Design a protein around this ligand. Structure first.
Ligand SMILES: [Cu+2]
Lengths: 220, 223
C-alpha cells in the first residue's frame, strides 16, 4: 500500500454536485507527493459558474496523500486500502445553513489515483453565505480528528471547517466522516494537520480553483 | 404487494442525468392507478432547458402501475417486490446515435411510490436528433416483452421505442432492461408476456419552467 506513494503520483478528481435544484460538474487534475504531504491541483467547473463557493467544496474534492512520519506509518489507513481503494462518506452541516452529503471512491486506475464523488446539498438558504456567495476565497488550517471504526473495518473522522466571510464573521461547517475499504490497518486516535492555499490561473477563462495543500499526521 | 395498488397512489420521480458533459435534474409528481393502468404525472426540469428532448426520457421516468388483469395477477413481478421495491437498469441504444445507461430504485417511502434514477448518456452526435432537438413532442404505443430471469430472482425486458422526427423519419431506441428485487422476500417470476403501452405528452400553459405533462395507459397481455 505505502509502496505506491513513494514519489509523485498523478491525480484525477471528479465531482457530481446537486444543490437546491442546481447541478454542477467539477474536474480536477494534478499531483500528490505523500513523502512531503503536498497536493498540487487545478479544478475546473465544466458546467459554468458554480452555484456554491469553491471553498465549500475543498474538503470534498485524497487524504491518502497526508504525510505520515515514520513513527506513525502503522496508523495510515488511507494507504494500504490501496490499490483497491476506500469509500469516503461525509455529512457536512453548515451552521445556520444547509447540509452537504457526499460519497466518494478513492482508488488507483493505472498510475493515477482517482477520486470520484457525488454531492447532494439540501436546505440551503437563498441569500445565505453559501448560495449568496459571501465566503472569502481562502482556507484555514484544521485538525482532522481520526478514530478507528473496527466494526466497519475502517475509520471515522470529525472536524469543523472555518470559512471566513466577507462580513468579517465566520461560517462553521461540522464534518462527520466515514471511510471503509473497497477490497478485502486500523489506527489509534490521531489527527491530521492541514494547510491550504486557494488561487487562480490568470489565463483561465472558465470558473476554476487552483489549490496547494500540505497535510501531515500527528498526535502520538 | 398487490394490496398496495388497489387505490390511487401518489408518485414521486427524480432523475439525475449526465449527457455528453451536460447535466440536468428532473422532478416528477402525480398519481397512478394500477386497477385501470393509468398514470398522471407532471415533470419539471429544475436545472433549466433540457439538453435532450423530453420524449427520450419517457421510458426512464413505474411499471408497477401497469394493469394486470385478474387472470395474469400471478405474473406481476413489479408489485410483488413492493413495498421494499426493485432496481431497474437499462441500456438504451439510439440507432445511428448515442446511448443512455440508467439505474433506478422504485419503492415505497410512506404512502408515496418513489422512482429515483441516474442516467448517463454517451457518444451522442451534436446536431443529431437528440442533441439537435429534432424529435416531435409525442409518443407512440409499444409492446414491452417481459421474460423471467430466475438466476437474478427477477425479470428481463426488451423493446424498441419509435421516436417520430420532425422531418417525417423515425428515430429508433432499442431498450434492454433488467429488474431485481431490493428485498429478500419472495416475488412472482412470470411466464413470457408483454405490456401494451399508450402515452400522451402535453404542457401546462401556466408553467414557465421547461416541463412535461404525461398521461399513460398500460395493460399486461399475451397469455
Ligand atoms: Cu448528477
Amino acid at each position: 500500500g505505502e509502496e505506491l506513494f513513494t514519489g509523485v503520483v498523478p491525480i484525477l478528481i471528479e465531482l457530481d454536485g446537486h444543490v437546491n435544484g442546481h447541478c454542477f460538474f467539477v474536474r480536477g487534475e494534478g499531483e500528490g507527493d505523500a513523502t512531503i504531504g503536498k497536493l498540487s491541483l487545478k479544478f475546473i467547473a465544466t458546467t459554468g459558474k458554480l452555484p456554491v463557493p469553491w471553498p465549500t467544496l475543498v474538503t470534498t474534492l485524497v487524504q491518502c496523500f497526508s504525510r505520515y512520519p515514520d513513527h506513525m506509518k502503522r496508523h495510515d489507513f488511507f494507504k494500504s486500502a490501496m490499490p483497491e481503494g476506500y469509500v469516503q462518506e461525509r455529512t457536512i452541516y453548515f451552521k445556520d445553513d444547509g447540509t452537504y452529503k457526499t460519497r466518494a471512491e478513492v482508488k488507483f486506475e493505472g498510475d493515477t489515483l482517482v477520486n470520484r464523488i457525488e454531492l447532494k446539498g439540501i436546505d440551503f438558504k437563498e441569500d445565505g453565505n453559501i448560495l449568496g456567495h459571501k465566503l472569502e476565497y481562502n482556507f484555514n488550517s484544521h485538525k482532522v480528528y481520526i478514530t478507528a471504526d473496527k466494526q466497519n473495518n475502517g475509520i471515522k473522522a470529525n472536524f469543523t471547517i472555518r470559512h471566513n466571510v466577507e462580513d468579517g464573521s465566520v461560517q462553521l461547517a461540522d464534518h462527520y466522516q466515514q471511510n471503509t475499504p473497497i477490497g478485502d490497518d486500523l489506527p489509534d486516535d490521531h489527527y491530521l494537520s492541514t494547510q491550504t492555499i486557494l488561487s487562480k490561473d490568470l489565463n483561465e477563462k472558465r470558473d476554476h480553483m487552483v489549490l496547494l495543500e500540505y497535510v501531515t499526521a500527528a498526535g502520538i
